[PDB]
Amino acid sequence: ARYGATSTNPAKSASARGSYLRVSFKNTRETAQAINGWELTKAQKYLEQVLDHQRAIPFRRFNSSIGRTAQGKEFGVTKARWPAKSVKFVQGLLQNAAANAEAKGLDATKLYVSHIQVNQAPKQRRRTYRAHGRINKYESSPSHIELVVTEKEEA
Amino acid sequence: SHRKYEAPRHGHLGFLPRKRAASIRARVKAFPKDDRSKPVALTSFLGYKAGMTTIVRDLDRPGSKFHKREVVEAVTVVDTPPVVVVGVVGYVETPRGLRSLTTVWAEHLSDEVKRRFYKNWYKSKKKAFTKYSAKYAQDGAGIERELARIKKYASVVRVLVHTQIRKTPLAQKKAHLAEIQLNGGSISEKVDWAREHFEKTVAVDSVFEQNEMIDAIAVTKGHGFEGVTHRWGTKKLPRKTHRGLRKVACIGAWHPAHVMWSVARAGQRGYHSRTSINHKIYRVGKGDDEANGATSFDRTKKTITPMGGFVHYGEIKNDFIMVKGCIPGNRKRIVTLRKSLYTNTSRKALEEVSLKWIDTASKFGKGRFQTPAEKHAFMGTLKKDL
RNA sequence: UUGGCGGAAAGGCCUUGGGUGCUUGCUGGCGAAUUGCAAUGUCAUUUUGCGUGGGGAUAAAUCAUUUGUAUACGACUUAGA
RNA sequence: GCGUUGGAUUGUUCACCCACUAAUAGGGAACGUGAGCUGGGUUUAGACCGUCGUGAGACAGGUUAGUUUUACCCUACUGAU
RNA sequence: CUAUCUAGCGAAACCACAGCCAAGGGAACGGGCUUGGCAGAAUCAGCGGGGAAAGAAGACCCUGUUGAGCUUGACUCUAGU
RNA sequence: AGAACUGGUACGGACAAGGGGAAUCUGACUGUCUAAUUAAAACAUAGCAUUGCGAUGGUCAGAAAGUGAUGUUGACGCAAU
RNA sequence: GUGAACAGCCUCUAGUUGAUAGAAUAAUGUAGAUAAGGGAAGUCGGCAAAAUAGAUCCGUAACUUCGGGAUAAGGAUUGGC
RNA sequence: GCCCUGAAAAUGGAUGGCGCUCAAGCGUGUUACCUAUACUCUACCGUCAGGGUUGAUAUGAUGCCCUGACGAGUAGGCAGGCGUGGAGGUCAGUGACGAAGCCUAGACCGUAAGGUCGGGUCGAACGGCCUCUAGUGCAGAUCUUGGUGGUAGUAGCAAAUAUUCAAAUGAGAACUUUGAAGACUGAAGUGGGGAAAGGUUCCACGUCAACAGCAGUUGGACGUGGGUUAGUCGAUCCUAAGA
RNA sequence: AGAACUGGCGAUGCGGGAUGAACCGAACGUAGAGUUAAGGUGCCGGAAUACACGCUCAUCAGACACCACAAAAGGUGUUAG
RNA sequence: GUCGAAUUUGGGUAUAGGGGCGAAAGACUAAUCGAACCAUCUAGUAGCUGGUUCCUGCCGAAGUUUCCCUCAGGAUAGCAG
RNA sequence: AUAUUGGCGAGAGACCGAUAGCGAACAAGUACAGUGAUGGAAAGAUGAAAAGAACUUUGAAAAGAGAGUGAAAAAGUACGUGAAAUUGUUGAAAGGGAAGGGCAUUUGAUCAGACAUGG
């Protein structure tokens, strides 16, 4: 408990977390935003296709030097990619949430992702050896991911 | 600081920037001065460049070591089926330039052209000029009005024509559409000619004739990203140079403190627009003619098509223009053949040619025979046959 | 509503014929206050979301796949019911 | 506006000859231009000589050998979305 | 084989603040100031003009009542003989 | 070692594997050194020459010594240039 | 096995198949090749490259410390049966 | 006198720019107009000066009140104050019904150093006034120690010829195991043993958080165990330079 | 580069000289109203495209102290003497 | 380049810092050499370089004299509180 | 009678308060480095009490979501408070080669000062 800022009816909502996960903070940020406010199954379906290389994740912030793809066109963008490890972890969290929702008997068909937020876990430090007898840091930038699914309210 | 020796700059700054052309169909940017005293006629034509071959002819040029003597010249052949007229566009003069006021189109358009208006034909509903057509319903007015508007205002008049690309070996089904200025006389006469030709066909032999000098307009063959050396013809640096030697060593003096628009740099080479002038017509082919490729000296029955077929193109089954020398663009590419913006009197330009012989051996290797008939005569019987 | 004219960016102009309101050309009958000695007191035109009733019309582009006249990647050019 | 060169000797700039040519003008751009090159000369440390000095050493004298680092950032410039 | 594009992995240098010019004056060569030219999101590959780019409180020079290695009939001594 | 025959005249068929000549400067040669900018014409060298010494000695060591190197030596030797 | 061979090249026994991977094939590179005609005109300088090369038989200058120089130079030959 | 010739330099460019020709140019005259932290008059802050006033009569005599003049500032001198750790004294000070601390384009006082309040968070101690005392106030010192960025998902992860099909196992297989194929080291070995050195890395079972700069079910890794058998092989004995 | 007297800059903002340590004006608590300085008043820009007599036409006019240079010498240009 | 000897090399042993060792380069003596490494004397000295921490109020400089192995420093007088 | 930065036993401080105080408040002369002489750190704080999260559900697992314990989980053996740099998400706003600042006012947001006169 204690997620970031949410403004959603907790009674119509369910949520999931993952902490100290060894995936790229920057890549997974980019992909969390890719499905933000999405209806869960659209999200689910799309992420499955990004694995299949049929659509992609737009890279909007952590993105300089990244190649260009025709697949960014959809999202008005030139620079997108296919972050498998990120997609994969986000899927696990979506899956969990979805489980938690069923347990609360929320309507699977009304569910959209109402909150999704990656921030930065503590780094994991390894060493690289460099020319002239030096050492440099070779680190991991792990992620904390949290998200929330909620029932869309009706007319 | 005063460059030690002097040399001319590499490359022409009048052909910048050296980028990819906007369209693959290079634009006609000038049509000939109009002489409104003579029959309404097209001022250019559209074709597909098919390949090159070789000619022999006597030269006619008093005072040349080669007068009254055979010379042998490269030619290029461009596949030139008839062009169909499907619209007229009228232009007015303004203090801001020529401007189009309307376009009036033909009642019926073929799929070939209609296809040019779509990116996904297979799955479109092909609604292209379907409401426009109905403008013909009414005994005329809507159409007849706009024709009248072009007569009243309108200062220059172009027809819209397209290629019949299906009459051509090309895989491409989408035809090429273009405006061509009508130079024959009188604005009113122009639009009538145009009206009368809607949906009708126009052949090259009504535009161009033997001995004529004509211009070619075409996008040049692409080559992708080039280095400085081949892109600009900059000089190789010595073998000894560190970090590579296809460069220019000095990109600039210290001031102006900015690399300047005139130094040579790597980037795109090819796929540029070129208007190439002064290409003499050496043949106007008839497609119905089974002796296309023959001469009053070489009496044999043969078509212009090489043994084996034009490499990377196929056969020539239509009217065609044969032009001396060479032309920008590559095989398969659309070319606009434009008439001269001027009255050349060159002597070279006035000469009337007559071919004596047209090469027809295979261009797919060192071909030794002009016709299947000649080959069999030479080789005698094989193990296939009979 | 009858004719016409206007392409320089015409998108406006002139015209014919009635209908309808007003008419301070002129002569009457009423009304106005207390908004209190000025202060906030005439409504203009832009977009944009919705509301009703009528007329109307009934596509494509992109990804993926494909060509190689194109190409570092994007991009270009082809093909696919 | 447009050109203004090919060589022999010298690290040379300069100089000087040969030779071609329409002509072989003169200069600037941090004495343009070394994360562009080269490293022949200068100008570290090895070394021979001549002059100088008791000597260590010295020489605007001769001679030989002597490691040429980094761009992935901004801008400019070339091209590309 | 690289570069390039993709998945995984993922450093460093450097950083007053920053980053389009012309002229002016100015610590006598401006990204900033003054007057003008101008000026349109977000970007990719290349590039070596500029950032008087970056790497060791300048190798040369001078100053200091700062040294050390070395030499000698400088000054003052000393093992030895 | 010889001879005949044979082939698109090829045949040390891949692999393997000295370019040569005429000279000038310089060091005789083989050898040696600046590990990480100098391999050289610098150092060595054999050869030549000079110097000291007969042991109570020459040359050198040690603070001193019943102390030490040459010396398991003796001038065809040891020591110093 | 080839061959003069503990060379190079291919093999048996034994041992490996481990040193991120996928898709492309721009510039510029790094490493490997080739170029018509000319032949050092390039350059401080033939730097780099190229050319020679095994064996058999012929032949082989000046000079010399008489040992050399010398694979001097220059030529013919080379498979298979 | 004005004007013209005399009058040649390097990025494109400067009467400041536009542009101006009975001027918006040059000489001269006459009015009006614009505008400085200056001048004039007034309010307020402070500084300095002069003067009045506890004579009995509530609350500051280093006070209250009246009057005139004055205000630039580096190095630097002096003054009056703001704030911190601790100390004597005092408010019989605040506090678990919430001390201290922290957060807050909320509020109020002060020219300022600062002080005060609300709200949030928090959890055990703390403050005002008169004094005393100093290890007492940071932006810098290529300052010290720590922590963090842009750079950047960038440079890169290209030497050592080379991999492929299938099955098995597994949550998961480009990378494990088995099979097949293709290849390499080529006995001057990528074969089989040792010396120095390491010290358990050897073998088995289990097993993947970290480590093996992709991965991992694999390992020289992690956990738990097992394992080195001498009259004849060494040391041990001998002597060497020498100690 | 070096002296004399004074005034400045340095230590100093403000208004003018586009810009600018030092020129012109004027020195500075917080403000209100008025007036000016030096300098300006076509437009940029607050302020007469004011008034008056002349002079000047430049195929290189000219335009304001310090100040961002110009001379000898010439003109049948035009002015007045 | 050399490649059967002034050859290459293991281990053992000896030489220690104004000392060693040097076919001699001021070379080498544990990434250290024109005097190694370690600790202490030591917070070595510095006329030189850098930095030196709250506010406001008042006053407010000097770059000159004389003397100094004085000339990037002091003392002295002046200016200032 | 005098000395006493050592040893043993004690009483103290206007001393320091975990970057301070001895190098060491801790398995500190430790871990680690170096052939060697020597060099030599970092590192304290859940809660009164482990009551250290039974059980259910998703997952290969780590974990998540519930539940539960507790005065509190805004204390979960990453643990008291939990600043800054720097970061994610949400909300508002601006943005033609930097951004930030001054005087002034428009517009939007936000906050005030009132306080009393017969019914």
By C1' distance from the Cα of B17, the closest nucleotide is: D79
Write the CB contacts of A155 (distance below 8 Å, at least 6 apart in sequence): none
CA distance B238 to B320: 49
Look at the block and give the residue holding tokens 């080479």: B269
Look at the block and give the residue holding tokens 């023959």: B294
* Residues whose beta carbon sits under 7 Å from strand D: A 65, 68, 78; B 1-9, 16-20, 225, 237-238, 240-243, 249-250, 252-255, 258-261, 263, 265-268
Task: Give me the amino acid identity at A43.
Answer: A
List strand residue ranges (DSSP E) for chain A, in order.
Answer: 13-21, 57-58, 80-81, 111-120, 124-130, 134-140, 143-151
B338's tokens? 């434009």
SS3 per residue for chain A: CCCCCCCCCHHHEEEEEEEEECCCHHHHHHHHHHHCCCEHHHHHHHHHHHHCCCCCEECCCCCCCCCCCHHHHHHCCCCEECCHHHHHHHHHHHHHHHHHHHHCCCCHHHEEEEEEEEEECCCEEEEEEECCCEEEEEEECCEEEEEEEEECCCC
B334's tokens? 């659309």
Q: Which of B381, B360, B357 is nearest to B369 (CA)?
A: B360
CA distance A27 to A38: 19
Q: How many residues does chain A have?
A: 155
H or E element that contains B103: strand B99-105
CA distance B274 to B267: 18
Plot region of A90 (φ>0 → left; ψ -120 to 50 → alpha; else → beta): alpha
Neighbour count for residue A1 (Cβ, 10 Å): 4
Distance of CA B147 to the CA centre of its chain: 30
List strand residue ranges (DSSP E) for A44-141, in order.
Answer: 57-58, 80-81, 111-120, 124-130, 134-140
Task: Give me the amino acid identity at A91.
Answer: Q
Whether the Cβ atoms of residue B256 and residue B262 lie closer than 8 Å to each other: no
Taken in order B169, B173, B178, B180, the sign of the CA dihedral is positive
Task: Give me the amino acid identity at B136.
Answer: Y
B195's tokens? 């009206």
Q: Which residue is nearest to nucleotide C78 (CA to C1')?
A: B172
Please give the C-alpha separations between residue B127 and each of B115, B120, B132, B137, in angstroms, as whole numbers.
Answer: 11, 13, 10, 17
Write the CB contacts of A68 (distance below 8 Å, at least 6 apart in sequence): A78, A79
CA distance B179 to B191: 14
CA dihedral B6, B12, B14, B17 (to 10 degrees): -120
* Helix A40-51 vs helix A84-103: crossing angle, to nearest 10: 150
Q: Which of B343, B218, B207, B353 is nearest to B280 (CA)?
A: B353
Q: Which of B340, B349, B344, B345 is nearest to B28 (CA)?
A: B340
Total H helices, total E strands in chain B: 6, 14
CA distance B19 to B21: 6
CA distance A94 to A96: 5
- Please, which residues bridge with residue B42 across strands? B182
Q: In a 10 Å sphere around its CB, with 0-12 CB exposed, 13-18 middle and 19+ buried, how is residue B379 labelled?
A: exposed
Neighbour count for residue B357 (Cβ, 10 Å): 18
Spatial distance from the CA of A152 to the C1' of I54 (Å):
92
- Nucleotides of strand G within 7 Å of the protein's CB atoms: 26-30, 47-48
H or E element that contains B55: strand B44-58
Write the CB contacts of B29 (distance below 8 Å, at least 6 apart in sequence): B275
B373's tokens? 């008939």
* Residues whose beta carbon sits under 7 Å from strand G: B 224-230, 239-240, 242-247, 266
Please give the C-alpha separations between residue B110 and each of B9, B115, B133, in angstroms, as whole numbers.
Answer: 51, 8, 13
Whether the Cβ atoms of residue B339 and residue B208 lie closer than 8 Å to each other: yes
Spatial distance from the CA of A97 to the C1' of K63 (Å):
13
End-to-end CA separation in angstroms for chain B: 81
Please give the C-alpha separations between residue B119 and each of A60, A67, A69, B126, in angstroms, as whole numbers.
Answer: 29, 26, 20, 11
CA distance B170 to A51: 38
A34's tokens? 């890719």
Instruction: For A43, list phi and psi in degrees, rounded to 5.
Output: -65, -55
> For chain B, where are the alpha helices, taking DSSP H only?
111-114, 130-134, 141-152, 187-197, 228-232, 372-379
Plot region of B43 (φ>0 → left; ψ -120 to 50 → alpha; else → beta): alpha
Q: Give the technique used to solve this structure.
A: cryo-EM
By C1' distance from the Cα of B239, the closest nucleotide is: G48
Write the CB contacts of B255 (distance below 8 Å, at least 6 apart in sequence): none
Q: What is the largest CA-CA distance in chain B?
A: 82
Q: Which of B331, B322, B326, B336 is nearest to B275 (CA)?
A: B336
3-state secondary structure (DSSP) of residue B223: coil
B78's tokens? 């461009």
CA distance A44 to A47: 5
Resolution in units of Å: 4.3
CA distance A36 to B35: 67
Write the CB contacts of A12 (distance below 8 Å, at least 6 apart in sequence): A106, A150, A151, A153
Q: Which of A117, A107, A137 is nearest to A11 (CA)?
A: A107
Neighbour count for residue B300 (Cβ, 10 Å): 14
